[PDB]
Short mmCIF file of C-alpha atoms in Angstrom, two decimals:
data_model
loop_
_atom_site.label_atom_id
_atom_site.label_comp_id
_atom_site.label_asym_id
_atom_site.label_seq_id
_atom_site.Cartn_x
_atom_site.Cartn_y
_atom_site.Cartn_z
CA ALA A 1 -183.69 0.21 14.81
CA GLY A 2 -180.79 1.72 16.75
CA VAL A 3 -177.18 0.54 16.43
CA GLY A 4 -176.71 -3.14 17.15
CA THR A 5 -180.48 -3.70 17.48
CA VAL A 6 -181.84 -6.88 16.06
CA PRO A 7 -185.63 -7.49 15.95
CA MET A 8 -186.42 -11.19 16.39
CA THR A 9 -189.16 -13.39 15.04
CA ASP A 10 -190.92 -15.86 17.31
CA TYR A 11 -191.31 -19.17 15.49
CA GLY A 12 -194.47 -21.13 16.43
CA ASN A 13 -195.32 -21.18 20.12
CA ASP A 14 -192.04 -19.77 21.34
CA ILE A 15 -190.06 -22.59 19.83
CA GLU A 16 -187.25 -20.37 18.72
CA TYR A 17 -186.32 -16.80 17.89
CA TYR A 18 -184.36 -15.78 14.87
CA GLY A 19 -182.97 -12.56 13.43
CA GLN A 20 -181.64 -11.29 10.12
CA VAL A 21 -177.93 -11.10 9.52
CA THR A 22 -176.34 -9.76 6.33
CA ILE A 23 -173.27 -11.68 5.15
CA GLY A 24 -170.89 -10.80 2.29
CA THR A 25 -170.44 -7.99 -0.22
CA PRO A 26 -172.83 -6.75 -1.54
CA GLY A 27 -174.52 -9.03 1.00
CA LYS A 28 -177.56 -11.23 1.61
CA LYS A 29 -179.94 -11.41 4.55
CA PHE A 30 -179.90 -14.68 6.52
CA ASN A 31 -182.31 -15.83 9.24
CA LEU A 32 -180.18 -17.24 12.07
CA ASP A 33 -181.25 -18.74 15.42
CA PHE A 34 -179.31 -16.76 18.14
CA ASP A 35 -177.95 -19.46 20.48
CA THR A 36 -176.27 -18.88 23.87
CA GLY A 37 -175.59 -22.67 24.09
CA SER A 38 -173.11 -22.83 21.16
CA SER A 39 -170.30 -20.73 19.63
CA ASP A 40 -170.17 -21.63 15.89
CA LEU A 41 -171.74 -19.34 13.22
CA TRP A 42 -172.85 -21.69 10.42
CA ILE A 43 -175.02 -21.17 7.36
CA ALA A 44 -176.60 -23.20 4.52
CA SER A 45 -174.35 -22.73 1.41
CA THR A 46 -174.49 -23.63 -2.28
CA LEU A 47 -172.06 -26.49 -1.56
CA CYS A 48 -174.75 -28.22 0.46
CA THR A 49 -176.17 -31.47 -0.86
CA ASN A 50 -179.10 -32.14 1.61
CA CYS A 51 -180.18 -28.56 2.44
CA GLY A 52 -183.74 -27.21 2.37
CA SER A 53 -184.82 -25.49 -0.88
CA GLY A 54 -186.64 -23.02 1.35
CA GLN A 55 -183.33 -22.03 3.03
CA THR A 56 -181.37 -18.99 1.82
CA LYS A 57 -177.91 -20.19 0.80
CA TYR A 58 -174.61 -18.40 1.10
CA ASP A 59 -172.91 -18.31 -2.27
CA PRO A 60 -169.15 -17.71 -2.12
CA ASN A 61 -169.14 -16.63 -5.81
CA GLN A 62 -171.29 -13.59 -5.18
CA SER A 63 -169.35 -12.19 -2.24
CA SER A 64 -166.45 -10.07 -3.35
CA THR A 65 -165.16 -10.33 0.23
CA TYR A 66 -165.05 -14.20 0.48
CA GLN A 67 -161.70 -15.70 1.50
CA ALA A 68 -161.35 -19.50 1.20
CA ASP A 69 -160.11 -21.60 4.14
CA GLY A 70 -158.44 -25.00 4.29
CA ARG A 71 -160.23 -26.22 7.42
CA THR A 72 -163.36 -28.28 7.81
CA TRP A 73 -165.80 -28.40 10.74
CA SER A 74 -168.50 -30.72 12.07
CA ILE A 75 -170.99 -30.14 14.92
CA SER A 76 -173.53 -32.13 16.87
CA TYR A 77 -176.14 -30.55 19.13
CA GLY A 78 -177.86 -31.89 22.22
CA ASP A 79 -181.16 -32.55 20.38
CA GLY A 80 -179.25 -34.82 17.96
CA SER A 81 -179.11 -32.41 15.00
CA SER A 82 -175.84 -31.82 13.16
CA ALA A 83 -174.11 -30.11 10.22
CA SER A 84 -170.59 -30.20 8.72
CA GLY A 85 -168.70 -28.28 6.01
CA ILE A 86 -165.78 -25.98 5.43
CA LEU A 87 -164.53 -22.76 7.07
CA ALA A 88 -164.37 -19.42 5.27
CA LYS A 89 -164.06 -15.67 6.03
CA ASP A 90 -166.35 -12.76 5.12
CA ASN A 91 -168.01 -9.64 6.64
CA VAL A 92 -171.08 -9.94 8.87
CA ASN A 93 -173.48 -7.06 9.61
CA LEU A 94 -175.12 -7.50 13.01
CA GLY A 95 -177.65 -4.68 13.45
CA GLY A 96 -175.58 -2.09 11.57
CA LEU A 97 -172.33 -3.38 13.12
CA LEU A 98 -170.03 -4.59 10.37
CA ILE A 99 -167.76 -7.29 11.70
CA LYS A 100 -164.87 -7.51 9.23
CA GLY A 101 -163.42 -10.89 8.36
CA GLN A 102 -165.42 -13.15 10.61
CA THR A 103 -164.93 -16.93 10.41
CA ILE A 104 -168.26 -18.22 9.04
CA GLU A 105 -168.83 -21.97 8.66
CA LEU A 106 -170.47 -23.09 5.45
CA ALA A 107 -172.61 -26.22 5.55
CA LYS A 108 -172.02 -29.03 3.05
CA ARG A 109 -174.45 -31.34 4.95
CA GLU A 110 -177.21 -30.74 7.52
CA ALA A 111 -179.72 -32.77 9.57
CA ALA A 112 -183.24 -32.87 8.10
CA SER A 113 -184.66 -30.92 11.05
CA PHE A 114 -182.39 -28.12 9.96
CA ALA A 115 -183.47 -28.61 6.37
CA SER A 116 -187.17 -28.26 7.33
CA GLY A 117 -186.95 -25.44 9.94
CA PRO A 118 -187.23 -21.70 9.55
CA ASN A 119 -183.45 -21.03 9.95
CA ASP A 120 -180.61 -20.59 7.47
CA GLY A 121 -178.03 -21.49 10.14
CA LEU A 122 -177.12 -20.47 13.74
CA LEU A 123 -175.31 -17.61 15.51
CA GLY A 124 -173.35 -18.98 18.51
CA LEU A 125 -173.22 -16.71 21.56
CA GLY A 126 -171.52 -18.97 24.15
CA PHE A 127 -167.80 -18.49 25.06
CA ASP A 128 -165.01 -19.27 22.52
CA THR A 129 -163.74 -22.18 24.58
CA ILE A 130 -166.42 -24.29 22.89
CA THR A 131 -165.95 -23.26 19.26
CA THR A 132 -165.64 -26.65 17.41
CA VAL A 133 -162.49 -25.42 15.58
CA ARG A 134 -159.61 -24.10 17.71
CA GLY A 135 -158.57 -20.51 17.16
CA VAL A 136 -161.94 -19.24 15.91
CA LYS A 137 -163.08 -15.89 17.38
CA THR A 138 -166.79 -15.62 17.94
CA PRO A 139 -168.82 -12.61 16.72
CA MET A 140 -168.85 -11.12 20.26
CA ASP A 141 -165.07 -11.51 20.35
CA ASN A 142 -164.78 -9.49 17.08
CA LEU A 143 -167.27 -6.73 18.16
CA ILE A 144 -165.16 -6.04 21.23
CA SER A 145 -161.75 -6.28 19.57
CA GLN A 146 -162.95 -4.17 16.61
CA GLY A 147 -164.47 -1.63 18.95
CA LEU A 148 -168.00 -2.06 17.55
CA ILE A 149 -169.38 -2.24 21.12
CA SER A 150 -168.10 -0.21 24.07
CA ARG A 151 -169.51 -2.55 26.77
CA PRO A 152 -169.02 -6.33 26.36
CA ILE A 153 -172.78 -6.94 26.57
CA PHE A 154 -176.00 -7.91 24.76
CA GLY A 155 -179.57 -7.29 26.10
CA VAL A 156 -182.07 -10.06 25.36
CA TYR A 157 -185.85 -9.71 25.08
CA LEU A 158 -187.77 -12.83 23.92
CA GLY A 159 -191.51 -12.27 23.43
CA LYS A 160 -194.52 -14.54 23.86
CA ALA A 161 -196.56 -15.81 20.92
CA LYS A 162 -199.64 -15.31 23.13
CA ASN A 163 -198.84 -11.55 23.29
CA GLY A 164 -197.85 -11.14 19.62
CA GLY A 165 -194.40 -12.80 19.70
CA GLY A 166 -191.36 -10.78 18.70
CA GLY A 167 -188.14 -10.18 20.57
CA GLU A 168 -185.05 -8.05 20.41
CA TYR A 169 -181.31 -8.42 20.87
CA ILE A 170 -179.17 -5.30 21.47
CA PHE A 171 -175.40 -5.59 21.00
CA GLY A 172 -173.58 -3.37 23.48
CA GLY A 173 -176.66 -1.97 25.27
CA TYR A 174 -180.01 -2.83 26.86
CA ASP A 175 -183.64 -1.62 27.02
CA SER A 176 -185.44 -0.82 30.25
CA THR A 177 -188.94 -0.53 28.65
CA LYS A 178 -188.72 -4.33 28.40
CA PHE A 179 -188.30 -5.12 32.11
CA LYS A 180 -189.63 -4.01 35.48
CA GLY A 181 -187.87 -2.92 38.68
CA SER A 182 -184.10 -3.21 39.12
CA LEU A 183 -181.67 -5.67 37.52
CA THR A 184 -180.02 -8.28 39.74
CA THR A 185 -176.35 -9.10 39.05
CA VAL A 186 -175.65 -12.85 38.97
CA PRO A 187 -172.12 -14.14 38.55
CA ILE A 188 -171.43 -16.51 35.63
CA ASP A 189 -169.36 -19.70 35.65
CA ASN A 190 -168.02 -20.04 32.11
CA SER A 191 -165.60 -22.83 32.91
CA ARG A 192 -167.50 -25.17 30.52
CA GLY A 193 -167.92 -22.50 27.85
CA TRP A 194 -171.54 -21.78 28.77
CA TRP A 195 -173.49 -19.15 30.69
CA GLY A 196 -173.74 -21.05 33.97
CA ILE A 197 -175.55 -19.88 37.09
CA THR A 198 -176.71 -21.22 40.42
CA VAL A 199 -180.39 -21.15 41.33
CA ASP A 200 -180.70 -21.09 45.10
CA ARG A 201 -184.04 -22.95 45.09
CA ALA A 202 -187.37 -23.48 43.33
CA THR A 203 -190.77 -23.33 44.94
CA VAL A 204 -194.38 -23.89 43.82
CA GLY A 205 -196.62 -22.07 46.32
CA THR A 206 -195.16 -22.95 49.74
CA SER A 207 -193.27 -26.14 48.72
CA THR A 208 -189.55 -26.34 48.01
CA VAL A 209 -189.56 -28.56 44.91
CA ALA A 210 -185.79 -28.06 44.55
CA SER A 211 -182.72 -26.82 46.45
CA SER A 212 -179.69 -25.19 44.77
CA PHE A 213 -178.79 -26.46 41.37
CA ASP A 214 -176.67 -25.24 38.48
CA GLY A 215 -178.12 -24.39 35.07
CA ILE A 216 -176.98 -22.94 31.76
CA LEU A 217 -178.86 -20.02 30.13
CA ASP A 218 -179.64 -21.29 26.61
CA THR A 219 -181.61 -19.09 24.21
CA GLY A 220 -181.48 -21.97 21.74
CA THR A 221 -183.34 -24.59 23.90
CA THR A 222 -187.18 -24.41 23.94
CA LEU A 223 -187.90 -25.84 27.38
CA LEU A 224 -186.70 -25.75 30.91
CA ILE A 225 -184.92 -29.17 31.10
CA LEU A 226 -184.14 -30.27 34.61
CA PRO A 227 -182.25 -33.10 36.27
CA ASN A 228 -184.47 -36.21 36.79
CA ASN A 229 -185.18 -35.70 40.51
CA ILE A 230 -185.91 -31.93 40.25
CA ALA A 231 -188.04 -32.61 37.21
CA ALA A 232 -190.11 -35.27 38.98
CA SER A 233 -190.50 -33.05 42.02
CA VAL A 234 -191.90 -30.17 39.90
CA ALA A 235 -194.26 -32.52 38.06
CA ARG A 236 -195.73 -33.82 41.34
CA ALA A 237 -196.53 -30.21 42.28
CA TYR A 238 -198.58 -29.79 39.09
CA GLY A 239 -199.96 -33.32 38.65
CA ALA A 240 -198.13 -33.63 35.29
CA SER A 241 -197.62 -37.13 33.85
CA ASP A 242 -194.43 -38.45 32.26
CA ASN A 243 -194.63 -39.28 28.58
CA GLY A 244 -191.45 -41.39 28.86
CA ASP A 245 -189.61 -39.15 26.35
CA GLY A 246 -188.23 -36.21 28.37
CA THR A 247 -191.70 -34.65 28.25
CA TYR A 248 -194.78 -34.42 30.43
CA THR A 249 -198.50 -34.11 29.92
CA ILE A 250 -200.02 -31.31 31.96
CA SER A 251 -203.51 -29.92 32.17
CA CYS A 252 -204.31 -27.36 29.47
CA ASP A 253 -206.05 -25.13 32.00
CA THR A 254 -203.24 -23.31 33.82
CA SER A 255 -205.59 -20.79 35.38
CA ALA A 256 -205.43 -22.85 38.58
CA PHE A 257 -201.60 -23.23 38.70
CA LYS A 258 -199.08 -21.26 40.72
CA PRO A 259 -195.90 -19.94 39.11
CA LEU A 260 -192.66 -21.88 39.36
CA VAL A 261 -190.48 -19.38 41.27
CA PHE A 262 -186.66 -19.46 41.18
CA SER A 263 -184.66 -17.75 43.94
CA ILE A 264 -181.53 -16.56 42.15
CA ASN A 265 -179.10 -14.56 44.14
CA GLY A 266 -181.69 -13.09 46.51
CA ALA A 267 -184.45 -12.21 44.09
CA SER A 268 -187.46 -13.97 42.62
CA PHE A 269 -187.69 -15.04 39.01
CA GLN A 270 -190.62 -17.00 37.64
CA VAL A 271 -192.20 -19.20 35.09
CA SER A 272 -195.76 -17.78 35.02
CA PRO A 273 -198.69 -20.26 34.85
CA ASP A 274 -199.36 -19.72 31.09
CA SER A 275 -195.75 -20.78 30.40
CA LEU A 276 -196.16 -24.16 32.12
CA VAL A 277 -197.83 -25.33 28.89
CA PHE A 278 -195.51 -25.46 25.84
CA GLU A 279 -197.97 -26.74 23.26
CA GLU A 280 -201.42 -28.16 22.89
CA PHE A 281 -201.89 -30.69 20.11
CA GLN A 282 -205.34 -32.09 19.55
CA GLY A 283 -206.40 -31.32 23.12
CA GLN A 284 -203.37 -32.75 25.02
CA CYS A 285 -200.97 -30.18 26.52
CA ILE A 286 -197.22 -30.79 26.74
CA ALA A 287 -195.69 -28.99 29.80
CA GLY A 288 -193.07 -26.21 29.56
CA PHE A 289 -190.54 -28.22 31.62
CA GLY A 290 -188.90 -31.51 30.73
CA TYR A 291 -186.15 -33.81 32.01
CA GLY A 292 -182.70 -34.93 30.93
CA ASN A 293 -180.02 -37.18 32.38
CA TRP A 294 -177.79 -34.22 33.34
CA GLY A 295 -176.64 -32.86 36.68
CA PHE A 296 -177.36 -29.27 35.60
CA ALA A 297 -180.50 -27.73 34.12
CA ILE A 298 -180.90 -26.10 30.74
CA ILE A 299 -182.62 -22.77 31.33
CA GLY A 300 -184.30 -22.42 27.93
CA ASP A 301 -186.98 -20.14 26.40
CA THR A 302 -189.71 -21.25 28.82
CA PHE A 303 -187.74 -19.21 31.43
CA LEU A 304 -186.19 -16.58 29.17
CA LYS A 305 -189.53 -15.43 27.63
CA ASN A 306 -190.38 -14.41 31.23
CA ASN A 307 -187.13 -12.61 32.35
CA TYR A 308 -184.96 -9.99 30.58
CA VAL A 309 -181.23 -10.89 30.50
CA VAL A 310 -178.16 -8.65 29.97
CA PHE A 311 -175.31 -10.99 29.00
CA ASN A 312 -171.90 -9.53 29.98
CA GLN A 313 -169.02 -11.49 28.38
CA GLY A 314 -166.36 -9.34 30.01
CA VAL A 315 -166.82 -10.05 33.73
CA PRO A 316 -168.58 -12.40 32.94
CA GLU A 317 -171.95 -11.91 34.62
CA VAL A 318 -175.64 -11.43 33.76
CA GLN A 319 -178.23 -8.99 35.10
CA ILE A 320 -181.83 -10.29 35.17
CA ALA A 321 -185.27 -8.74 35.65
CA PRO A 322 -188.88 -9.78 35.12
CA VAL A 323 -190.33 -8.90 31.68
CA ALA A 324 -192.57 -5.81 31.55
CA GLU A 325 -195.91 -7.20 30.50
CA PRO B 3 -188.67 -28.20 21.06
CA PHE B 4 -185.00 -27.45 20.26
CA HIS B 5 -181.89 -28.34 22.35
CA UNK B 6 -179.09 -26.32 20.74
CA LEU B 7 -174.53 -28.59 22.81
#
């Protein structure tokens, strides 16, 4: 792959996408979940006492470039998972781009869900205002400042398990074979350390299920999680029923449904009918949208596997376009 | 489903 190109792996039914990162000298390959909703780079280490045996573990002793650090860290995600450990410094190779002396966070403890998943840790791609430890420069900060990328951007392509899965991240460039038409520039509000946008409205057919709302673009969240009222309004349009846990039961046959269309800055972005169904387990289908007790939405993979995004950290802004499929 | 902060 070209410079800064990282081929992704689609886990399950578009649950998550992870790529290979080489850390240390001589270096080991790690499978990290690329997350635009967090800014801490953490990995399973040999200091970990409740880590998966299936996970690949960073071993300080085998990296001739490891530098010890006196600080500790602890994190807690929105789905309730967590991890904690110590800070350190080493080299990280992101698609042929060698980031020298990056602050990596080595896990001493991790939630079981982490221990049982396909990931060795996470790559945080949100702004540095939300790093859990103050003064830590995120990978994107180091690429820029080390001149590894000329444009302060990353192009994101998330594939669909139904079409073979895959995905691709490109640091400092993008790929037009992956999208159709022209890109639309949308300004970003990073005042909370996230990639925040304003959706002008949402429609199902001719009905306005929602008016403007704010959402964060999170590559690390599976569904489209919407405020309670918006969520309920969408559900009524599809005849989905509330499971009482942030999820909905929808009909497995989406052939009859209309796409959920989002009017963002003048253009139309959608959640195609197939995408309205997340998973089917023993004949019951769980919808691709959920609800949370938040005032903003979490624009997760359900949406991203349908639209190509160019994340610009410098302005900041994003450029979006419908996936070529 | 995941829900990464």
